[PDB]
Nucleic acid binder design. Structure first.
Lengths: 493, 349, 475, 486, 184
RNA sequence: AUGCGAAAGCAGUUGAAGACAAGUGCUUGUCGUUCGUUAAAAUGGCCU
């Protein structure tokens, strides 16, 4: 003997733009929440170590949000002017906020009360303030003073190493993963500089020509840099000192840039960017930086951040908008006498000679139509296929299977008028498509072959035939125009 | 020394049996395993250890064929709808019996079975049958080495227990009788050679809720026959009830009195009688409960008197769930809830 | 071990072993040099086998019982051929034989000489100050079998013709258990529990050497003419001393050592091996009483050896008639489609108030909502003007977007058809200029292919439907 | 009711009808338990054991219309499982071999007979096999070349059978028909399964390409058309089940048969591509997108010819550049890069088109030099280093019309190292042709002038392939697999 | 250089030549039910049932006598119509097989044994009609045979015993029926 | 339903004898019957 073959569904030849697995994951990202802040939102940082928290800047406001309940857990509001950047340390404990009066304030997360250290930088506003990645006692901050100073937070009176040689409005910088001494710095005249700190540091080691004003710089790899500026974005090799790709798939100036790697995904590395139109678009660096997904937020979108690589909770994607709007989008996530009496269940056979297994892998439930076609009740199978709220593919596979077995007229013999009407209703609907049009051609051909006399006798089916005639004529018109357009293409070859 | 010593078990020992000819014990519990031990007095070692998957065990018995004697089987059963049959040196041959031919609405669980012989009586070819409990009065009877469905008997009320007796007839002919006991105490006796037809009914005296019946003193499904000439007729029939009372009948008067008075009514135990086991000869009756510790008593027959010096108060019996007498060497094997069988040797035999 | 007393034959082809079975001992002979379910059961549940021996033309074995009897058991028929009895009720503590004379030590020191080919008791026998005894061997002086050796922690050389001791060697602390004549001048002796073997020389009465094993000794066997010795040690092992009687050198260590380890890491104990001229015969217990064997070359294996046997520890039940899983070898695999990619063969791949500026913006970008609004614009003059004002690469990407939207939403193929109509009207120059028009306008070609192929069955269905409609309308 | 049997005591009855189910009746309670999907109908059934351990039965495989192909079965009766299955090779031929009768049933359909139809069909089949010189019996048979396993494509199924151990190893259903969910009885017997026609392997061995057609039911609106489907299957070298990886519905548009499949050589894409040729002129080249995981078009050549010819062939050079597409009367030489005519800049009379006197049944190239063509009457061996025919051979009395247009390719095949082998079959006539046949086997060299070896076999030979250790396997009408070897 | 041999075989040689359906099967499970024996179209396969494996195979082309019985290439009229398991000559010498061919030929072969070039051959006289079936209880043997004078056949039932001489198989006319249609 | 043919189609085919049943020597039907041609039924459906 053998087993019963389950009925195969009807998979038509695939139409273009099917749903890709990257689209599956980035559409699982759902459950939008909108939070109206006071003013614009500049920068959004995630805690690295236990990634369960993320800071968001505002006007004179830093807010620590939580990944578990998406509510604001803490507020740093001891600022006297507009705060620019709130970035956590690479170690978790201590976050730094660069203000616009000209000073940075570095104090521990989960304690707004204790200002731990206040570094007075240049009197121009300091936009970007980062901590180092490899080392954890060296902070680096830029300003509108067009210099980036490397402070050592033990000796917070003097910049341990100043860094000049730029031209205008340094606003982005990035350390590089493998080299713990090499700092890339994105200015505002383009011209991404690369400094080596164990050298003099007054001059860059070498420059890179991103001809538009670069808006952000991220070391995506130990050997690669990604540059966000102007309309396009451009990814550079480091050692060979050459651009590698240039993706100009945006409309206005791209603004923010984020990169995540080796996480629970069909896509290994995700490079996402945010571009002042609501458009946040997500690329992958393995298929040469092609777009895989994109959301649209209404206002001009400033900052974006995807949850870090070791989140292990519900992952988040945060986008902050110049209308004052934070948008969070989150992928979610008896007695002892009796047991002593019967304590042999969980054993699983660890120390025995011969282990035998026989029990069956239980199949999924058969639907009612499949039970009826397996038990040869053809008319009940047809009615149970034409119960109302089923799937189009399922009603198609019932009719396909029943026609393939041959029980068309056998299924249609005993039908009275009120039972013809459900078949004719779905027939009247499914005349519009293509595959359903072929199968409805077969089945209404045999219905008109059978029931002409009761068609004359009862008036309801007469009106149904009127609707069917109108819709089939309309479909002939559609296919005539389509054949004409195909002829036009064959001319235009 | 405990037969379960060299390779312990992880649940209660639900079924002990000695192989009818070779020195071998077989134990089975809810650990879904089957362990066969070569038994000495000194070192009782593990011959083989099979482990089924997802199927417990409540009843495992040996069964050697009668006309063939070079055909051994091990029948295992738990509360599922199949019954495994291990055939008898590197990998087992385990058939399973899973289909009742038509009569499937009676038993939803194969767990209460007994194994007996039967003679075709047109051809004189004996074969093994498998008796199963059932729904209300149903006892189903399946031909073993083919899994076929032979015959069914229906007693009324609830079956609580059943048993198998033989009767020799002449040179080369016996006939087998099935005894089945209701929960009220009404006893039916069918014969299986001609089809299920009630030979007789009677009633046990007292017996308010009767939970086990056993026949003993001749050949039976525990101390079994090895050739057709060696089949005897049983003498004692013991009926143990839920209250602790064990009535005890002589068959040579019961079959003639047709609503008999017991030879005895033992009342030493006080909880539900969950095991009865006669000696291979029929001189000792071992009655043992399951609901409380240290609840086994041996009885000398025909005196119908409980032995007084064993077990003593320091005998390691546990909650006795399995008892198996040995056919030849005079051993007794007791298995408890902790999973430790324990041997004794009677020095008379 | 469940193997109480075992002994090989001469020439090492069959071992006898007596083992207990439901408190009744059975003896059984198994062949080794390449099952046998024959046995002999001792009917009484009290008499045990106390000593064992093989005897040569019909092969037989000799079983000195507990009772006071010496059975003579043939092998071919499981039958005690003849049961000698010492005229007493004691335990035969030892049996031995050379040629036809048979000699047994009783439990009460009484030597008995029997004759086999006469089936008779020749002489009862006892001497002085041999008061506790448990081992006897007989020296091979030829066919004159005089001057036998006895022992119980003090080996004594006793002559028969005068019934007195001649030499007496110092034995052990524990009683002796092995006493074997090695050469015509030397013999080895090993007690019960000592790891030591004393190689004595007879006539001098001295200790030539001692050989020290690694654990307590259990069984000894030696080669032909004093070349090698196999030792079954109490832990389960085998220790060959190569050339023991050669050139402090008072004590000698074991040259070659053999163990047996299975695949699962467990340690299988050896009992009762047998050595010969470059052929070592090792035995163990596979199942609880069934003896398995092996032959191996001890002059070629290294000094330390672990025999690797394949013991079924945690076998997966590979049934011969079932598959690897589920079905049998006679069924037929079903046709399961699965997640196969179903495509056609017409899928070409791998081979004035306008809105033209917002359209060209959306298509430099890729905006579903913006393109949807521009397509929700309807007026045909505006459509003609926008495509008249557009750019050709923008037109190509517009054609692709329109065709994929048509193929999904086939309800939307009126207005999108007039859109693609005007596009193909206007921008046809760049379209005839681009080489691979199929690979560019793939989805458009496929969608029109499906619909144009759908047409004729629709014509047929409308023909029959109109026939039936006019039939019921005419009357 | 086709088979009946009793048990030994006489209480169970075994019933063996058409619907593939073996039914055990308890006679007393009139009850039944039955085994429902038995790989064919039960011609015969009985019990064996002295207790009734085994049920032994004989199955028909009634779908095989060209030849009755039995299957013996021995069932363990406790488990109701198959303790033994006995079979040989199950080829499907093109016509009914000598005096085969279909089983009897309630109607007369295209798998069985009525009673009167049985008698008349017996006599008519014998008379037609005597009279008509149309007759051919040519079976498709493929070979797995990394395991050397014969694949007999049954209708809607594949019997994987090896020749060394001489036993079946697998049976797979390669079509979404009505193959097993039912035992066909009367008008289900009027219906039929979709038929596998072509089956090929890549030279790598790890891809199977199956072309099948499917017929609609009769007396319906859409009964005129067919649907032709291509399928691509994978497996790893340790299993015995092919996974469907790519299903291509309707190659070359609607209702267009693909009358030749050719795999690719190694050098082009590591032998991971195939060529499909219609009866119109179209050639498509499918290959394996490996950044995807699928098969797709990668080079087309689709002309619109208003003439349909049933007999095409094609061949491929070892470098992967030259493709010889032989349509009826005309061989075209194409470059693979362009799929167009290889027009010589030198023009040394190496013309891109050859016109041959008869319709082409076979094109082959034994090396990169010699092209063999088997034409509808004759055989012509040509060189390609000089565009002129080397050798000729007349086959018009031998193959007049005794083969359909397109089966001489499976008749005659070539070793890729030494030579090719011819196959000629004539039936022994007495005074009118009789039943028995006679097939001669001739082996030529690369030049085809000298015959390497001549042999003769008695029974008709239906297929010759070459075993990849330089020998030749041949099937026979009575399925006796033989070899011509070194 | 080039040799043409025959390496593998097919069809299982049913009992269709009767077309009266006596018993369509002729395979016979052995005495101790461990070996199954099927007569193929060109060989006799002996499968083993505990491991589903063809153990011994008895081809027709190797020994010359079978090549003279079945391998007459002008007509395949002779076919195996019965297989009996014992020895018809001597009582219980095991591993022997007697085979009854359609036209009076009876051969004693030895499965599970090296095939020597002396299988015990016997020819049955009086077989101007064709043999149909051969069966036996203990000792006594009977033969159904097909003869003719409405396109039907007569079934003659003969009684077969042995040993008036060595070659002689004693045949007696038990009974006869005239126009059979089915027979089981 | 045979031959040629492409997935279309193009040509051609349904003859006698015998026997039996039923109805009235005559009508139909039937065939486990011959020769000549390229020639729907028994309320009964797939295991665990």
């Amino acid at each position: 003997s053998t087993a019963r073959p389950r009925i195969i569904t009807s998979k038509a030849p695939l139409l273009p733009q099917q749903t890709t697995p990257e689209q599956r994951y980035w559409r699982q990202y759902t459950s939008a929440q909108l939070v109206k802040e006071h003013n614009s939102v500049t920068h959004i940082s995630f805690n690295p170590q236990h990634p369960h928290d993320f800071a968001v800047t505002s006007s004179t406001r830093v807010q620590i949000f939580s990944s578990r309940t998406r509510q604001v857990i803490k507020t740093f509001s001891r600022f006297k002017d507009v705060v620019y950047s709130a970035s956590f340390r690479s170690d978790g404990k201590l976050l730094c906020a660069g203000d616009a009066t000209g000073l940075v304030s570095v104090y521990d997360s989960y304690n707004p009360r204790t200002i731990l250290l206040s570094i007075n930088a240049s009197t121009h506003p300091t936009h970007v303030t980062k901590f180092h990645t490899q080392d954890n006692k060296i902070l680096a901050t830029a300003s509108d003073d067009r210099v980036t100073r490397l402070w050592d937070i033990s000796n917070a009176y003097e910049p341990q190493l100043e860094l000049t040689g730029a031209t205008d409005y340094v606003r982005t910088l990035s350390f590089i993963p493998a080299a713990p001494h090499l700092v890339a710095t994105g200015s505002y005249d383009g011209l991404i500089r690369l400094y080596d700190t164990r050298s003099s540091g007054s001059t860059p080691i070498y420059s890179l020509n991103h001809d538009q004003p670069v808006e952000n710089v991220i070391a995506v790899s130990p050997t690669q840099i990604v540059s966000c500026g102007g309309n396009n974005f451009k990814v550079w090799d480091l050692t060979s000192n050459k651009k590698l790709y240039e993706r100009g798939n945006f409309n206005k100036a791209v603004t923010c840039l984020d990169y995540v790697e080796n996480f629970d995904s069909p896509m290994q590395s995700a490079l996402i960017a945010s571009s002042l139109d609501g458009h946040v678009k997500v690329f992958d660096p393995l298929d040469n930086f092609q777009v895989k997904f994109g959301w649209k937020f209404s206002g001009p979108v400033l900052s974006c951040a995807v949850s870090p690589s070791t989140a292990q909770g519900n992952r988040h994607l945060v986008a902050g908008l110049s209308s004052g709007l934070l948008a969070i989008r989150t992928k979610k996530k008896k007695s002892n006498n009796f047991q002593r009496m019967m304590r042999g269940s969980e054993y699983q056979g660890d120390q025995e000679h011969i282990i035998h297994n026989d029990k069956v892998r239980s199949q999924r439930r058969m639907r009612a139509f499949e039970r009826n076609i397996n038990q040869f009740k053809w008319s009940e199978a047809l009615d149970n296929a034409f119960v109302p709220g089923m799937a189009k593919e399922l009603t198609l596979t019932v009719l396909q299977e029943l026609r393939k077995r041959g029980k068309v007229r056998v299924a249609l013999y005993g039908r009275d008028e009120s039972t013809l009407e459900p078949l004719l209703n779905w027939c009247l609907k499914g005349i519009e498509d293509v595959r359903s049009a072929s199968i409805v051609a077969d089945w209404v051909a045999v219905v008109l072959e059978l029931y002409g006399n009761t068609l004359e006798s009862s008036p309801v089916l007469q009106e149904l035939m009127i609707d069917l005639k109108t819709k089939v004529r309309h479909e002939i018109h559609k296919s005539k125009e389509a054949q004409r357009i195909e002829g036009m293409l064959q001319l235009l070859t | 020394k405990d037969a379960n010593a060299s390779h312990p078990s992880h649940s209660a020992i639900q079924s002990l049996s000695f192989h009818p000819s070779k020195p071998l014990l077989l134990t089975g519990g809810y650990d879904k395993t089957l362990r066969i031990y070569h038994i000495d007095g000194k070192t009782n070692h593990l011959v083989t250890s099979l482990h089924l998957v997802g199927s417990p065990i409540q009843t495992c018995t040996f069964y050697t064929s009668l006309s063939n004697q070079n055909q051994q089987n091990i029948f295992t059963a738990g509360r599922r709808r199949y019954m495994h049959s291990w055939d008898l040196s590197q990998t087992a041959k385990i058939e399973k019996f899973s289909r009742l031919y038509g009569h499937e609405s009676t038993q939803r669980s194969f767990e209460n079975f007994k194994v007996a012989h039967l003679q075709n009586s047109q051809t004189n070819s004996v074969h093994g049958i498998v008796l199963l409990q059932g729904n209300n009065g149903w006892i189903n009877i399946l031909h073993s080495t083919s899994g076929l469905w032979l015959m069914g008997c229906k007693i009324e009320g609830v079956i609580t227990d059943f048993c198998i007796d033989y009767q020799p007839i002449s040179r080369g002919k016996f006939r087998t009788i099935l005894i089945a006991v209701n929960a009220y105490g009404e006893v039916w006796e069918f014969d299986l050679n001609k089809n299920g037809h009630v030979i007789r009914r009677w009633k046990d005296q007292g017996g308010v809720g009767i939970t086990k019946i056993q026949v003993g003193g001749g050949t039976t499904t525990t101390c079994p026959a090895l050739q057709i000439s060696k089949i005897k007729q049983n003498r004692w029939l013991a009926v143990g009830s839920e209250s602790g009372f064990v009535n005890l009948y002589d068959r040579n008067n019961a079959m003639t009195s047709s609503t008999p008075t017991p030879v005895a009514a033992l009342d030493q135990l006080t909880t539900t009688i969950s095991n009865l086991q006669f000696s291979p000869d029929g001189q000792i009756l071992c009655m043992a409960s399951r609901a409380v510790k240290d609840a086994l008593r041996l009885v000398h027959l025909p005196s119908c008197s409980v032995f007084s010096n064993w077990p003593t108060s320091g005998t390691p019996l546990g909650k006795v769930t399995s008892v198996a007498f040995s056919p030849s060497g005079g051993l007794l094997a007791v298995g408890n809830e902790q999973g430790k069988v324990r041997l004794w040797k009677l020095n008379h035999y | 071990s469940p193997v109480l007393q075992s002994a090989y034959d001469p020439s090492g082809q069959y071992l006898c072993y007596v083992t207990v079975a439901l408190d009744k001992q059975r003896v059984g002979v198994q062949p080794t040099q390449r099952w046998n379910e024959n046995f002999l059961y001792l009917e009484d549940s009290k008499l045990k086998v106390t000593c064992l021996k093989w005897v040569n033309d019909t092969v037989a074995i000799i079983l000195g019982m507990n009772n006071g009897e010496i059975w003579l058991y043939s092998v071919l028929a499981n039958e005690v051929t003849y049961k000698f009895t010492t005229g007493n009720s004691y335990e035969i503590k030892d049996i031995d034989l050379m040629g036809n004379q048979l000699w047994c030590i009783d439990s009460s020191d009484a030597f008995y000489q029997f004759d086999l080919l006469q089936f008779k008791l020749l002489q009862h026998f006892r001497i002085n100050n041999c008061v506790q005894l448990n081992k006897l061997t007989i020296v091979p002086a030829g066919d004159s079998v005089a001057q036998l050796l006895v022992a119980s922690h003090s080996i004594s050389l006793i002559d028969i013709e005068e019934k007195k001791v001649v030499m007496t060697f110092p034995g052990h602390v524990s009683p002796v258990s092995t006493l074997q004549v090695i050469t015509n001048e030397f013999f080895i002796s090993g007690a019960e529990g000592d790891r030591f073997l004393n190689v004595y020389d007879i006539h001098s009465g001295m200790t030539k050497c001692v050989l020290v094993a690694e654990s307590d000794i259990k069984e000894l066997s030696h080669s032909g003419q004093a070349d090698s010795i196999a030792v079954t040690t109490e832990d389960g092992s085998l220790e060959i001393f190569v050339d023991p009687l050669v050139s402090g050198n008072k004590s000698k260590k074991s040259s070659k050592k053999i163990q047996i380890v299975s695949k699962d890491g467990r340690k299988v104990p050896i009992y009762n091996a047998f050595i010969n001229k470059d052929l070592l015969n090792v035995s163990w217990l596979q199942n609880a009483t069934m003896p398995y064997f092996k032959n191996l070359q001890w002059r070629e294996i290294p000094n330390e050896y672990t025999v690797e046997i394949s013991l079924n520890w945690n076998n997966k039940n590979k049934s011969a008639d079932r598959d690897l899983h589920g079905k049998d070898l006679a069924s037929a695999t079903n046709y399961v489609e699965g997640n196969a990619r179903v495509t056609s063969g017409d899928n070409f791949k791998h081979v004035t108030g306008t809105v033209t500026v917002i359209l060209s913006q959306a298509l430099q970008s890729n905006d579903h909502s913006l393109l949807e609004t521009v397509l929700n614009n309807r007026d045909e003059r505006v459509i003609r003007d926008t495509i008249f004002r557009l750019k050709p690469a923008l037109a190509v990407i517009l054609l692709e977007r329109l065709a994929e939207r048509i193929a999904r939403q086939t309800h939307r193929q009126g207005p999108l058809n007039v859109w693609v109509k005007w596009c193909l009207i206007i921008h046809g120059g760049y379209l005839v200029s681009i080489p691979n028009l199929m690979s560019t306008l793939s989805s458009l070609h496929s969608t029109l292919k499906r619909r144009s192929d759908l047409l004729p069955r629709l014509l047929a269905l409308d023909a029959r439907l109109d026939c039936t409609i006019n039939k019921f309308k005419t009357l | 009711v086709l088979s009946l049997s009793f048990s030994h005591d006489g209480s169970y009855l075994l019933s063996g009808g058409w619907e593939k189910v073996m039914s055990l009746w308890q006679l007393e309670t009139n009850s039944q338990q039955f085994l429902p999907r038995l790989n064919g109908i039960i011609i015969d059934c009985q019990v064996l054991g002295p207790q009734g351990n085994y049920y032994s039965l004989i199955l028909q495989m009634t779908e095989n219309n060209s030849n009755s192909d039995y299957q013996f079965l021995l069932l363990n009766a406790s488990d109701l499982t198959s303790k033994l299955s006995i079979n040989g090779p199950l080829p499907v031929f093109n016509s009914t071999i000598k005096h085969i009768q279909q089983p009897i049933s309630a109607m007369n359909t295209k798998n069985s007979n009525s009673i009167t139809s049985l008698n008349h069909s017996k006599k008519k089949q014998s008379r037609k096999l005597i009279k008509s010189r149309r007759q051919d019996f040519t079976t498709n048979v493929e070979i797995n070349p990394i395991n050397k396993n014969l694949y007999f494509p049954h209708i809607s199924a594949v019997q994987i059978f090896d020749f060394y151990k001489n036993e079946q190893v697998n049976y797979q259903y390669l079509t979404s028909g009505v193959n097993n969910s039912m035992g066909k009885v009367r008008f289900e017997l009027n219906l039929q399964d979709p038929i596998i026609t072509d089956l090929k392997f890549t030279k790598d061995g790890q891809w199977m390409i199956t072309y099948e057609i499917e017929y609609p039911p009769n007396d319906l609106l859409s009964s005129k058309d067919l649907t032709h489907i291509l399928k691509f299957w994978t497996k790893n070298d340790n299993e015995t089940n092919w996974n469907l990886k790519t299903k291509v519905i309707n190659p070359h548009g609607i209702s267009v048969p693909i009358t030749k499949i050719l795999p690719s050589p190694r050098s082009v894409n590591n032998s991971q591509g195939c060529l499909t040729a219609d009866n119109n002129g179209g050639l498509k080249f499918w290959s394996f997108d490996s950044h995807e995981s699928n098969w797709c078009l990668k080079k087309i050549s689709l002309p619109n010819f208003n003439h349909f010819s049933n007999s095409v062939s094609l061949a491929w050079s070892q470098d992967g550049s030259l493709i010889f597409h032989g349509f009826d009367d005309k061989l075209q030489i194409l470059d693979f890069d362009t799929f167009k005519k290889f027009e010589s800049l030198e023009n040394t009379k190496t013309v891109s088109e050859f016109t041959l006197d008869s319709e082409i049944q076979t094109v082959k190239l034994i090396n990169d030099t010699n092209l063999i063509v088997a034409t509808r009457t004759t055989l012509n061996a040509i060189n390609l280093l000089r565009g002129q025919v080397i050798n000729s051979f007349d086959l018009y009395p031998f193959v007049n019309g005794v083969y359909k247009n397109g089966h001489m390719d499976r008749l005659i095949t070539c070793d890729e190292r030494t030579g090719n082998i011819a196959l000629v079959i004539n039936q022994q006539l007495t005074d009118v042709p009789t039943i028995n046949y006679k097939s001669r086997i001739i082996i030529f060299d690369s030049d085809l002038s000298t015959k390497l070896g001549n042999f003769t076999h008695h029974e008709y030979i239906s297929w010759i392939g070459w075993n990849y250790d330089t020998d030749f396997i041949f099937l026979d009408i009575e399925s006796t697999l033989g070899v011509v070897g070194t | 250089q080039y040799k043409l041999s025959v390496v593998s075989g097919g069809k299982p040689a049913l009992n269709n030549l009767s077309s009266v359906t006596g018993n369509k099967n002729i395979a016979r499970l052995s005495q101790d039910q461990r070996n199954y024996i099927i007569p193929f179209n060109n060989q006799i396969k002996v499968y083993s049932v505990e491991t589903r494996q063809c153990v011994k195979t008895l081809k027709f082309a190797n020994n010359s006598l079978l090549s003279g019985i079945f391998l007459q290439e002008e007509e395949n009229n002779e076919s195996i119509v019965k297989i009996l398991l014992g020895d018809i000559t001597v009582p219980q010498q095991a591993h022997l097989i007697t085979v009854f061919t359609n036209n009076g030929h009876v051969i004693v072969l030895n499965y599970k044994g090296k095939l020597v070039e002396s299988p015990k051959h016997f020819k049955i006289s009086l077989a101007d009609e064709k043999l149909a079936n051969v069966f036996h209880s203990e000792g006594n043997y009977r033969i159904l045979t097909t003869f003719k004078d409405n396109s039907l056949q007569s079934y003659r039932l003969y009684a077969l015993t042995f040993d008036d001489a060595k070659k002689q198989f004693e045949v007696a006319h038990q009974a006869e029926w005239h126009n059979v249609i089915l027979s089981n």
